[PDB]
Amino acid sequence: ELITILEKTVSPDRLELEAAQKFLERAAVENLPTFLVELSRVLANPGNSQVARVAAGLQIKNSLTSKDPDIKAQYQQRWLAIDANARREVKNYVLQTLGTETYRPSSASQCVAGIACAEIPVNQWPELIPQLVANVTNPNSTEHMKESTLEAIGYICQDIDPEQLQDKSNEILTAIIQGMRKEEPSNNVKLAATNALLNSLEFTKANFDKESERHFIMQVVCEATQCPDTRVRVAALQNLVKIMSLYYQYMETYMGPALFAITIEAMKSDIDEVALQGIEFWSNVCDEEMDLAIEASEAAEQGRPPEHTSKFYAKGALQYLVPILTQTLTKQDENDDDDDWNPCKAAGVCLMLLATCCEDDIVPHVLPFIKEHIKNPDWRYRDAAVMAFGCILEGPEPSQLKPLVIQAMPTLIELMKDPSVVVRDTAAWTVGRICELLPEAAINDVYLAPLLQCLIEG
Amino acid sequence: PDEQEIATLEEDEEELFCNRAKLFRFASENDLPEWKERGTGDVKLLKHKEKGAIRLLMRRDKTLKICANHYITPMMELKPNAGSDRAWVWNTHADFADECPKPELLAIRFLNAENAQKFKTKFEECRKEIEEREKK
């Protein structure tokens, strides 16, 4: 009768939760195999409520997994010592309950992943991978079956050690790609498959090394990025960002013909969840290229760099990135918090990263926008111009930045008194950064301290 | 939704005093009675339009939650923080801050001197008025 105490686990009362936890601990300590068998029997039966099945699945998962690696290893070793017949029964119950859950987050998939992490390195559950592949590839499988199996496969790939499943990585990737393909009618299946691919990217290094398999993966991801569903697009863009982060050196053949247009369209899109990822792609590209530049600077002493394959994609895309970021900076509202993570802040951060990366080359592509919109009657464009001018201050040589006392200062001083609060605050931020820049750009400190004090109070 | 028209219930009353300050709550229930924070905000004294009841009501800042809410009685007279010049300590027997009456000991520090003195004079005036009202 574990159903009652498992149902009690959702109640907010302290006494009920404490009693439920005590009963669970007592049952687990008294007889672990029988307790697991009863939990799996509760999980398998579809007549129970959602809460009971979810709680039983979570308890089973917690019986095998822990954040501390030592505790997780201890749990897996304890699991391997259970009676073979009881293990067979519980594994059969957990495997059969796949596809009978009407809720999107399947609790049985976590149990499957835990048992897989426990047994696959010892090769104790050989039927698991063929059964999952058959479930995914069977045309007669229901939507819930496909979603549960894909989530289980993704969890298994993300959790287990990469070396233990290299033989069946090909079949796993084939199943995931067949889930992600356009022909699939269910959007939920697409989302689950894309999330599984995202979780399994680190596991497929050997597959990515093969040219044909890497090309197929890139093609299917680029196909998925154009899916009508917004969540699928967001997941695919996250996949692209992860691929760029992990396999930068392999993106030469794909950048430009396919990735450039997709990223530009994502940046120009009006959906925030898409524009954020579009900007984040180039932000991560700039960060990786900055790391490679640091590596090259270090290896200048060592003669040859180990993996400096920096193609300067950011520099080539600068003239297209800058106008889009400046246009994005305009989209703002008065009642919006300045710390709200809208595309405006992402665009500003991307502009700062581009300034720090391309250095002296940023100014020609940004300065005309500042000159045009520094006095635009619309407060939004004026805010965008002052924000961009403040962003571009870091990274270019101060001797090149000398055209700031000529025209910038007398206008930003006025902007510090602008009726709009937003432009006032952003001009204050800009002049604060100018306060840090000016000790470098000043020929002498004869006016450093007085002007600094005047600008602090400005 | 059920927003209707939000009323702060400050109407039908005159706001005699209002200034910014920080308030502290005495942890009498704790084994160590030392002071604890309560919030920062404008401390307001509200006098009823015709009932002649003067009450203290202070909310917090950026959250606008009640942290002290009780009436003013003629018994709240003597105890000051005369050792310092930026503090005031008083006792209340029925605090409805958490929608439940409790006894409380409270402290307050406005900025340094002038706000504290003005608050003390206004508090003494209100207390004298309530004493005159109750004497009849």
Partner: protein, 210 residues
């Protein structure tokens, strides 16, 4: 059911976070002592917005692995959650992806807020430019510090805006209710006078700290 109460979950990490951020909102204080959370202590928080009253059943989850109890059991039927990490220890930031994964594996696209505590302590160990996780997963980030009450109300405001469905939602002043007037025995009045003088003698030590 005139309330719109939501089951909020605070995951955080070992120490450095919850049960002080919550206690700041609940009663108003700064717990300077580290009492490790033992269980899933629940505190109902109430806020007032222009759209009406809003309630949060805050399920405070212990950060220590040995005190977790029902580790993921509390992440059930959750509708919003907050991940908290200390900006003075990079280890607590390293574990944020694990907490996000655990939250996602049991809840479907629930709103999540990433908060960095202890920003007022100075000597910040996790620079603002080094925090990139919120960009990766489209998570809302904030800088909070319960000691100085710096942006301590922002996460709840953002969560309320997301859950209710009104970007223009703002915190409003809580209505005031007239307290009831009661009197008691004069012996308790003398006891309270003794407590009053005890309080007035001990007020100065708090001033020196402040």
């Amino acid at each position: 059911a005139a309330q719109v109460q939501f089951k909020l979950v605070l995951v955080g990490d070992g120490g450095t976070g919850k049960t002080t951020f919550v206690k700041r909102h609940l009663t108003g204080e700064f717990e300077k002592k580290y009492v490790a959370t033992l269980g899933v202590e629940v505190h109902p928080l109430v806020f007032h917005t222009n759209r009406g009253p809003i309630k949060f059943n805050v399920w405070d989850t212990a950060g220590q692995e040995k005190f977790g109890g029902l580790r993921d059991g509390y992440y059930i039927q959750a509708q919003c959650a907050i991940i908290m990490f200390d900006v003075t220890s990079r280890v607590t930031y390293k574990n944020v992806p694990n907490w996000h994964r655990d939250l996602v594996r049991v809840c479907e696209n629930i709103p999540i807020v990433l908060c960095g505590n202890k920003v007022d302590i100075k000597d910040r160990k996790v620079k603002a430019k080094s925090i990139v996780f919120h960009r990766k997963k489209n998570l809302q980030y904030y800088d909070i510090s319960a000691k100085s009450n710096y942006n301590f109300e922002k996460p709840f405001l953002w969560l309320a805006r997301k859950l209710i469905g009104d970007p223009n939602l703002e915190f409003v002043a809580m209505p005031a209710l007239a307290p009831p007037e009661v009197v008691m025995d004069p012996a308790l009045a003398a006891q309270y006078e003794h407590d009053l003088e005890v309080a007035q003698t001990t007020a100065l030590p708090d001033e020196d700290a402040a």
